């Protein structure tokens, strides 16, 4: 009877606000992958852990019409709710030769040596076991295929949430950005770790590039990002008594902190570094 966070309607519904954060790097990942000017043809592409379609959307806006005539795009995710949203986007944006499909990154069910490109945009730090997913990526890539991934190194949004939580009486705990980033898998916030892991599996020409981004978003949108994340952290970081005393106050505390800090009509400055990784399957 246990739920997976990513399958819950409330999570999926707020994810459009969170995609303003992951989406900072969708163009980066597509462009760094070389998919727009590769020799590989036709293209056979997997957007693995596609979410609500950030990478797929960029692909459909970036690739030549001629390339889309012959490609096949598979938008894969474990979450039925994520794919339902992606399906609507696929229709609304008019993606060509694209399909949604349930794909478990740890056990894809997809054929050996099938894809010219596998994209994993902010998936590896969310999977139960990143390295098992990475092995699947290697398996399903064709000879000459490219893996392109984005993972987080640093960001300011967890620290902003922490600062808000620190305005509640009781000295309540909250993760550091590093603790949050490595909740499921360590290493994917380190260039050297990633380089070594891909090379150990047999990927070649491995490149891992840290890319800084800064933008801003309205306080009301940022509130939704916080409300998506914080409820899943509290059972891990707070006691039962702390939750009984303070969990119901978190939304008010967040509103007050954001208004007080950034202004009632203000914008929250988002700052991140993601690791953009590419590797070739020989
Ligand atoms: N085992 C698994 N297999 C495939 N997807 C998984 C998964 N575990 C989690 N996910 C998916 O990983 C995604 C992480 S959020 C990143 C979504 C998207 N690529 C973007 O850049 O916005 C979610 O859509 C979640 O449902």
């Amino acid at each position: 009877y246990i739920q997976n966070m990513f399958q819950t309607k409330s999570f999926v519904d707020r994810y459009k606000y969170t995609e303003k954060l992951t989406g900072l790097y969708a163009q980066t990942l597509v462009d760094y992958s070389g998919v727009a000017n590769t020799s590989q043809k036709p293209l056979v592409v997997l957007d693995n852990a596609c979410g609500i379609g950030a990478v797929s959307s960029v692909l459909n806006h970036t690739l030549q019409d001629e390339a889309k005539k012959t490609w096949k795009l598979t938008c894969g995710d474990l979450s039925e709710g994520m794919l339902e949203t992606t399906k609507r986007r696929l229709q609304d944006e008019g993606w060509v030769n694209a399909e949604t499909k349930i794909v478990n990154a740890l056990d894809t069910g997809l054929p050996d040596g099938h894809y010219t490109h596998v994209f994993v945009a902010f998936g590896f730090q969310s999977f139960p076991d990143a390295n098992a997913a990475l092995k699947e990526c290697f398996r399903i890539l064709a000879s000459g295929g490219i893996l392109a991934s984005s993972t987080w190194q640093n960001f300011n949004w967890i620290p902003i949430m922490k600062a808000a939580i620190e305005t509640i009486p009781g000295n309540l705990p909250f993760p550091t950005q590093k603790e949050f980033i490595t909740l499921h898998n360590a290493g994917w916030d380190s260039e050297s770790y990633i380089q070594s892991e891909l090379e150990k599996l047999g990927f070649r020409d491995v490149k891992v590039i840290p890319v800084p981004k800064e933008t801003s978003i309205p306080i009301d949108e940022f509130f939704e990002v916080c409300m998506m994340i914080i409820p899943y952290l509290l059972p891990k970081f707070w006691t039962e008594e702390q939750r009984e005393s303070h969990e119901k106050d978190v939304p008010m505390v967040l509103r007050q902190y954001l208004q007080d800090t950034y202004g009632a009509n203000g914008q929250v400055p988002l700052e991140a570094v993601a690791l953009i990784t590419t590797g070739l399957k020989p």
Side-chain angles (χ1 to χ4, degrees), residues 2-282:
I2 304 310
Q3 283 201 113
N4 180 311
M5 182 179 76
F6 293 110
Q7 294 172 345
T8 67
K9 190 186 185 290
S10 70
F11 187 93
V12 174
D13 288 347
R14 286 190 178 104
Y15 193 78
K16 66 186 179 193
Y17 303 101
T18 301
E19 194 190 48
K20 303 185 180 280
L21 290 48
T22 60
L24 293 173
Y25 292 97
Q27 193 72 48
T28 315
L29 189 63
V30 166
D31 287 348
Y32 285 30
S33 75
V35 69
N37 55 34
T38 174
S39 286
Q40 298 196 84
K41 47 164 291 206
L43 301 172
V44 183
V45 180
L46 179 65
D47 186 0
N48 199 5
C50 70
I52 63 173
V55 167
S56 292
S57 182
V58 169
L59 288 168
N60 277 274
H61 288 104
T62 298
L63 291 173
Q64 300 181 235
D65 285 356
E66 187 180 302
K68 296 192 298 187
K69 189 188 191 79
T70 56
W71 84 332
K72 183 62 218 186
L73 172 65
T74 299
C75 315
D77 203 279
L78 185 69
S79 170
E80 285 177 10
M82 290 291 194
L83 296 179
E84 286 181 59
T85 304
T86 298
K87 269 200 216 72
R88 285 202 313 280
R89 189 177 192 172
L90 184 160
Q91 294 168 346
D92 291 344
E93 299 185 3
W95 302 346
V96 2
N97 291 341
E99 61 173 358
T100 56
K101 188 214 272 257
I102 293 283
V103 174
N104 182 353
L106 275 73
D107 186 42
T108 63
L110 301 168
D112 287 4
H114 188 77
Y115 297 94
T116 59
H117 296 80
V118 171
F119 291 89
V120 192
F122 305 108
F124 285 121
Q125 294 153 320
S126 292
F127 304 148
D129 195 280
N131 290 180
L134 181 64
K135 290 197 206 308
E136 276 292 275
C137 293
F138 186 84
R139 181 184 69 74
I140 69 181
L141 281 163
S143 302
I146 301 296
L147 173 61
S149 70
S150 56
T151 51
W152 297 114
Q153 185 166 73
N154 285 288
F155 45 54
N156 71 333
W157 39 93
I158 286 290
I160 292 167
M161 295 180 219
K162 186 159 191 158
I165 292 298
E166 291 177 350
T167 69
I168 306 176
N171 197 24
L172 298 178
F174 201 76
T176 64
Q177 60 180 286
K178 172 129 182 123
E179 292 167 344
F180 181 78
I181 287 167
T182 66
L183 271 178
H184 298 109
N185 299 285
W188 287 86
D189 57 316
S190 159
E191 299 95 294
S192 54
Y193 174 93
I194 296 174
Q195 186 88 216
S196 177
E197 199 61 24
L198 268 71
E199 286 174 356
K200 266 46 175 293
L201 249 61
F203 284 103
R204 289 263 183 75
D205 201 7
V206 175
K207 301 163 180 162
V208 186
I209 300 165
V211 178
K213 295 281 186 169
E214 294 97 43
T215 189
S216 72
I217 64 167
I219 59 172
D220 290 341
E221 295 180 1
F222 190 70
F223 174 86
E224 299 297 336
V225 175
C226 299
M227 293 284 79
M228 191 191 75
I229 290 172
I230 294 172
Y232 292 98
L233 293 171
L234 300 190
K236 305 168 190 292
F237 284 87
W238 290 11
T239 65
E240 290 159 285
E241 182 168 4
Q242 285 170 334
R243 295 176 71 196
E244 286 165 30
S245 298
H246 298 115
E247 181 152 3
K248 64 174 65 59
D249 297 319
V250 167
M252 184 66 83
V253 167
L254 288 167
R255 297 280 202 194
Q256 291 173 338
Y257 181 79
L258 296 171
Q259 291 154 190
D260 293 348
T261 304
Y262 303 106
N265 263 296
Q267 296 270 316
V268 187
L270 303 174
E271 298 161 14
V273 181
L275 300 183
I276 308 299
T277 297
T278 55
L280 177 77
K281 171 160 188 205

